[PDB]
């Protein structure tokens, strides 16, 4: 009768579970797998490097709460994708790295097969889960296992190994169709115990200076209405982490973002909503949090092992952010005195003061452009385009764009994440445009852009509405370092006055060079209104910024 | 008295053992280490991605027989360099991956440190050896162990973990000097037992159709005149593997490289000199080697475990290739009746027949230009510049240049190696220029170039004598595949008529576009005579080549 | 002021979190730690082999829902305990392996330290979590991380590495006390989504022949009242897995355990309660589960990744068993038409018929005594002592005892578990006596007893009320195999008539040798009435049973 093969079973299983996009790099043994995927209706985005394909799948999971799919080749390409898979596991982004595998009997004897590697054994230390499928009748379960492990609990990167012999296996079509699995409740809701919610309300009500910390886990949870209702109805000031910006508008009257240091030092009870007390929050120790013993933490997290990871947590609340926030909110709507207005006014005054010190730098046109004057232009662009996605990476380009550029809608800012990775830029830009269809503004340091620069060709090839702004200051941090022996360039500088706009022109994209904030503002508007792939080489003062 | 620190002990340990070059990417916590190396006289080449820095270190080890040094950054950058470190282990290239790491007490408890990763534990499954240095007094011993493990036995990649607190430690300067170790016999000679040489000669004399196969291990050994004497004085025909080309000149009268399939099929005794019976030699099984049981193998390898890896080896000879071929040459000099005449003259038959079949394809003009006609010009360049270095990667551009371009001096060709990696090009080109001082011809496929093309800025920054030729056929293998749904481009194509030469001009380099073999020869000759960094975009027929 | 050290901080951290018993084997560097633990009130149990101390800590966690503590020694003893730690992770038992480790700077360079091993990196691929504490101020958080990982989520074995340098560090006593963490909600409740509960009930209400399967996860949860109510109020027949026997009395009228084949083969909807569809349930595949597509599974489990692991689960319920069973039970009390009576009467007939065939063998008293008749005596013992603990391991001794001996109270049967490990017997028996204070009856095969028999001295030394019954059939499976060459004993046999009773008396315990079921009965009653350590050597027909 009718027959099917491993090629079609893999594709049929992915389509059955809502997968629409495959980021990949072709080659042996997965070339015809990607072709069949494209012929079956899936959109296939081919990159110049598997790591950039993996970065796209990673941020795609963050944007969609569905696992981003990265398909790669044996050993060398698998390793390029595994580095992105490890970064996805670090940031709690759901993702499935699918990779071709060589002949199992040669690899297990280490006889030197083509692209030889026990990729299953190599992947496990660096990701959340790893599975290998040897039989075509198990492709449905294998994909189902990979999806569950990627989106359930704490989301993360999963590795799905498919040996080349699997694709050519042939079984009965009706048998294979019944073997496919459409996953029921891939990321199930987990509700907290009422005894834990009651303990959290008790601590929260006792606070003289409470504070909510919104992490990117709260943004990933996509409980926007519930999270915002928790902030407003409680009246407690909040501070968003980098990728939680825009969940509430960064100009919200309860936002203490421009007063982050005071809100963290002077608070007494802190509510962590999908935010880890890691290096980004000084591990809960030091002067950042005031004197030892002055803090009490309530924590909302799907992973119960994250509790007591750094300091004592008196009110652990385990469950998905959607279910736990609504449980806290339902306890607040039935009983809540109010946040002390003294704490509100202290943060509001210090916030306005910091914004006042910031305002002159934004309107300080000078030659050459400083970081502040250029970001003042891009901040207005985002304010005028609150639906656009902002990719951002670098050091000065990153740390200053985070504090200057206000976000207004959730999940619109995508940056270096937990490992502080340089190289996420162009891969994130491709996935942001592919997944959402919104315009992407990619604010890049010139050192950060170089880690993934060749993907501007991929951006051009698929005609994506990405506007790349390179803060060209001729180096890492600054461009003033020099060789004391007078023989080489500096360890941290690049070719002086590099014209990255000419690099974009090499692939049919728009290339612009600007030297003033107004020239930058006009060039960005032209690019984001037209939707054409654009790279804007912006000249930044090589002396401005910091070495850190 | 005077004090020193871990920053200086690390440099003084590397200086003491002959390290002259550091390939790296600056950042936390190793930026000051790279600046001090510049101040202490080492050459620091800073790349745009860490993988290309490590690819440079791997090929620099192959060229120098001294370990190549890649200095990287914590976890995100360590993983980027670890990929190339694993490739060096696969190709037996001596290399040391030096990476900073975070606080040991925060990573041990997995509390989310800056760039958190137990890089020692993660490196061990992927490289030859891994070490971590906690105390400054052990920096010298740590560097010693890293060097010995890198160059001794079968060479390979070594990871050296330096925690950030190690640099800041301060000890007595005189005590620190007496802690440094100048390694004695880092790669010692290993001489084979006479009874194993005798077993080999008995098998060799019994041969009626003997064959020598020179692998890149023999080219790495730098026993050139001995290896050549073994070939010429025994009269036995030889077949050179890819990167063993040029060890003997490829037009040598004893070369059966143009009769490779006949030499491998009909021979009865094969002498492997630093060559593994892996996928590159069909694992010693199948029709490539004629009928089963018709082969007896003599294998010369430093690794005793390489024997009997795939098929039975009747005459194993374990030791460094220098000591082994010389001991084998003495036995031949004392007792050898020559090589059977009709076997050498049968190979000359198929050799001259295959070359004559190739000739009309090297002179056939076409529009667009094909692979064979363009490589016929590049073959003349290498013949006219016989001491220039050839870097070559791709698929059609790789396999066709390997058979068309003849090398004349040893260690002059650097290609994808054992894993078939794409992305080594610009890294190998940088190291070849820096380590040797020779000119570099980089023959690249457009897909292969994309994996590492961003480093053309590094090629320009240090003004290295690199001439890049992109075989632009608009995609992988071919440039004709299309999306059957007509929505996106095909999975294996790129932006049609991409002008990579414009990208080179973005960083100050020379950019040329050529369309004929005659134009290609002029541009290469001008670039390699001037020594200026140059990228030549060669338009290749999108329909030429092989689809696989 | 007042000072404290790492020794006291480790002990006080365990005492603060409710730890009361430490299973260990003393040595360098943890000898003085165990001494301090005993001096500080904790009960320290010293074994003859670390693997048996770990097996004690493993089943101790299953019995108490608090992690069992094994203290071991560097590398060689760590590896012994790690083997038990891996098995605890396989069986989802909460357990912490605390090992001392060598000098970190010497191990990191692999210089050959006393007990040199990176025990953190070795334990990670074999257990659920692993941490290493370097500073005394992190001992409190370190213990809190080990406890949370051990009991929360799917419980499992955790490794806690304590370098020897840690124990001797001295800090302020008030600073040290404030650094301790008393874990809040170490194993939090996880409530299921109402929509998931609605889906399960609807699938349940549509069942013509529903079946409940209770796994040892339901026994571990200690929701005995809720689980018994779910079965008795729904009227659905249930099948208990091995260590779930007794949760409901094995003679409960709703039990179909004596009709297991018909229940598993002919049912249509199967509610798994803490049971995995693994080898012990034929992976939900094959004739065991009837015809393909005749089954629909509801699964209650705390691990969301366990769903769809073998076959498709149409109704996954994710949460702790206490919350999910109560959630199911709440809806059943609102609307439930009652279980189909034809399904009950069909199974009740099969249960009556099956027990009839087992009946004659249970009282067939031949000479030598056979497996069925001897276990028939021990089946009477457990009925008369429903509060006593049963430990059971072997092959024939395991399978037949599992089916013949009925359990009447929850968590009284402790057997080989998920991996089928031989050697859990004596370690489990020590933990069961110490943790529960109840009489322990250990039914052992002579081959299984050899994996841990040396621990009978541990039983005697601590005067534990353990009654050991060795089923001495003189070999593995059977004692009839011989050497076909007539030189050695058979590969599977032992010394004929080995007097394990006279071995017990070598350490002060009571030893008996019985040959009839009544002799076994009178000896077991006498042993368990007195509470003295006793071993009965029961002479079993060497030809009885099966093999393989
Ligand atoms: N759906 C979810 N429900 C609850 N917690 C979540 C969910 N998704 C992610 N998290 C938690 O969010 C936390 C994010 O921590 P981090 O990634 O450090 O946020 P940021 O880095 O913005 O502070 C992780 O601990 C993760 O477990
Ligand atoms: N100095 C040396 N002396 C002897 N054998 C060596 C030396 N350096 C490398 N080798 C051997 O060379 C062999 C190269 O195998 P391969 O890398 O497969 O060469 P190719 O790929 O050109 O055949 C390896 O087995 C390695 O052990
Ligand atoms: N507290 C709990 N709440 C829910 N499920 C649990 C709990 N403790 C253990 N489990 C589940 O119990 C299951 C045990 O499966 P198994 O160990 O195979 O039981 P048996 O061996 O009787 O089948 C595991 O999947 C584990 O996740
Ligand atoms: C993969 C990786 N490699 C290296 C680093 C170290 N690093 C941190 S920031 C940075 C570059 C910062 O320079 P740039 O992108 O030009 O932004 P600027 O500060 O100059 O505005 C680097 C290389 C890193 N974080 N990740
Ligand atoms: C890291 C890695 N990714 C993917 C592959 C699969 N692969 C094999 S050859 C090749 C590129 C061939 O295209 P090109 O470089 O343009 O040479 P051409 O055949 O077009 O002349 C690729 C991507 C690989 N070998 N390595
Ligand atoms: C650690 C370990 N080693 C080996 C085995 C293999 N094995 C399974 S059952 C068994 C012994 C069965 O013989 P016995 O314990 O005497 O019980 P009997 O069947 O004779 O009643 C063994 C060795 C195992 N399950 N575990
Ligand atoms: Mg910069
Ligand atoms: Mg190409
Ligand atoms: Mg036995």
UniProtKB/TrEMBL annotation, chains A, B, C:
Identify the keywords attached in UniProt to this record, alphabetized: Lyase, Magnesium, Metal-binding, Nucleotide-binding, Thiamine pyrophosphate
Its Enzyme Commission number? 4.1.1.8
The segment(s) forming the Thiamine pyrophosphate enzyme TPP-binding domain are: 396-537
Which residues does the record give as ADP binding sites?
Answer: 154, 216, 276, 278, 301, 321
Q: Which cofactor does it need?
A: thiamine diphosphate
- Locate the residues binding Mg(2+): 446, 473, 475
- Ranges for the Thiamine pyrophosphate enzyme central domain? 197-328
The keyword Lyase is assigned to this record? yes
Q: Specify the Thiamine pyrophosphate enzyme N-terminal TPP-binding domain's residue ranges.
A: 6-122
Q: Which InterPro entries match?
A: DHS-like_NAD/FAD-binding_dom, HACL1-like, Oxalyl-CoA_decarboxylase, THDP-binding, Thiamin_PyroP_enz_cen_dom, Thiamin_PyroP_enz_TPP-bd_dom, TPP_enzyme_TPP-bd
Gene Ontology biological process terms from the UniProt entry:
fatty acid alpha-oxidation; oxalate catabolic process
Summarize where thiamine diphosphate binds, as residue positions. 395-397, 420, 422, 447-448, 473, 477
One MF term in the entry's GO annotations: thiamine pyrophosphate binding
Family recorded in the similarity comment: Belongs to the TPP enzyme family.
**Protein name per its UniProtKB record:** Oxalyl-CoA decarboxylase (Oxc, yfdU)
Species this protein is from? Methylorubrum extorquens (strain ATCC 14718 / DSM 1338 / JCM 2805 / NCIMB 9133 / AM1) (Methylobacterium extorquens)
